[PDB]
Ligand binder design. Sequence first.
Ligand code: 2CH
Ligand code: 2CH
Ligand code: CL
Ligand code: CL
Lengths: 298, 288
Amino acid sequence: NEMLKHEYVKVNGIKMHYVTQGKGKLLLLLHGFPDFWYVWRFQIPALAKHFRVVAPDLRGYNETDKPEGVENYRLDLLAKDILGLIKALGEEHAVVVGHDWGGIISWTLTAFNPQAVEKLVILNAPHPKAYMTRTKNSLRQLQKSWYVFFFQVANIPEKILSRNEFAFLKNMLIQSFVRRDLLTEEDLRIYVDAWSKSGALTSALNYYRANLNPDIIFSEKTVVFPKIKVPTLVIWGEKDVAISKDLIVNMEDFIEAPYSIKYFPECGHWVQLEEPELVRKHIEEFILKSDIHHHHHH
Amino acid sequence: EMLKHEYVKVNGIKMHYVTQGKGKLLLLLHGFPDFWYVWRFQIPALAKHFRVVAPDLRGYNETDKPEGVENYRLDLLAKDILGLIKALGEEHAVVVGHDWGGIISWTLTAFNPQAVEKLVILNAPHPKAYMTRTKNSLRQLQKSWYVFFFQVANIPEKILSRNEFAFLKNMLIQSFVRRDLLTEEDLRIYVDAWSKSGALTSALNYYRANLNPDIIFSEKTVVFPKIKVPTLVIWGEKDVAISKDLIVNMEDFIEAPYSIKYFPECGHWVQLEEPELVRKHIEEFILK
Ligand SMILES: Oc1ccccc1Cl
Ligand SMILES: Oc1ccccc1Cl
Ligand SMILES: [Cl-]
Ligand SMILES: [Cl-]
């Protein structure tokens, strides 16, 4: 049957790497910082039983192209990469699942391009308008976002994050997990391989510099963000060291469509690694649910 | 004898201070985003018994404000205070420091024990505890979000000062344990000091010079002599800016009588929240 394959495609001016397995509805899985496609290792084979799973490396990461310059990492361009990818895969629509930055991009792609997104899944990613509105008024979110401010400085964060074989990034991950020994030494080797790709760390930090700089966080302008019009599932690990529960209060207000949120009270930011089977189960059930209900109790 | 203003040349700069009282010299040193006025509740009461001197530190209020991040390095700040003691015609002082004033007081004391009779610290980490422990404390890194914010040029000054310092006012107000601790009058006086030409950038330069990420995440050992003079630490436990991680286990840092008084219901601005009890503890420590 279908085994995992690596592939490469031109999208929106760049060459993007992805892995894919399975046949059927296109299901994109989009990672965040400081991950790459491999973050989805527990979900790919299980979802490939039902779906055509595609897990790309985003702009800047791992095997994907890394344009120079902060302006090349603005949210608008990242979402246009994903629209480009759906087309380059020979499709018009996708179910889109996004974690962390992958989720911020997914919220954005869905709001501005609802025609490309059949259903939306978000894991532990604040709605961008909630972040931009609420952060400056939330001491707990400002505290949790200490590293967003750190990342704004040029040159020096890349140096600090990469010293002693990326000890800093390893520690960021390790201190974020609810369970000990979640990553093996072997997993850490694989992550260092990706982090070490020339230009990867600078490009990753450029997402923060382009979209979460202090002028934006403390802006007096309100952000324009259309309501979400496609069925949405949010999966949320509650012990998230990066996102305050302040930012998810009344999240459903952003959605004018069927909306479900599944809380995982004992899991953290990396919910897909902490309860990988229950995450997979919830995503599958959501996608396979019929949108037409004309045979109650048959 | 009432509170009087003075100005004195020290270490290349002119420093403004207020003073009241006669006898043993007692220095009160403010931190960010304060000035001498933060000591308003303690100065008259302590002046009954001591020669109280409360300066504006380098960069602040009516004190000189040299240009350039390098001019705010800790060694220069402590040398300003050594210079002040001498300019006041003394050879030593009792030194009380809050926040940056406390970081400076730890530094002055460690390197110049001859200039310090006794040391009082209010809600200020030992600089070497900060430099050693912060990188290993998620709670301290989180509480220091604003230290990272302040590293970037120009933009923090803009944000902090917009809408008549609404941002800075909010930083203070969110830090206090009680509502309406500052009167409208107090806020006018704070705004007046924040508005002094160059004050805000010079204040932020302390963080850029001393708490930049190269320092915080350095793996080098910091060389800091043990404190050799009697020390009292006063600590408001509801401090939004400092984790209890940084103040425990001072034994390695202090080779002299040391005591710590915890204020479980007070925050970072302990001298404003419990002004009488703070003053009482200071007075008893110096006299007894
Ligand atoms: O580090 C990213 C962006 C800041 C919000 C937390 C995650 Cl999604
Ligand atoms: O804002 C200052 C310096 C960083 C530690 C907290 C206070 Cl003393
Ligand atoms: Cl392959
Ligand atoms: Cl759970």
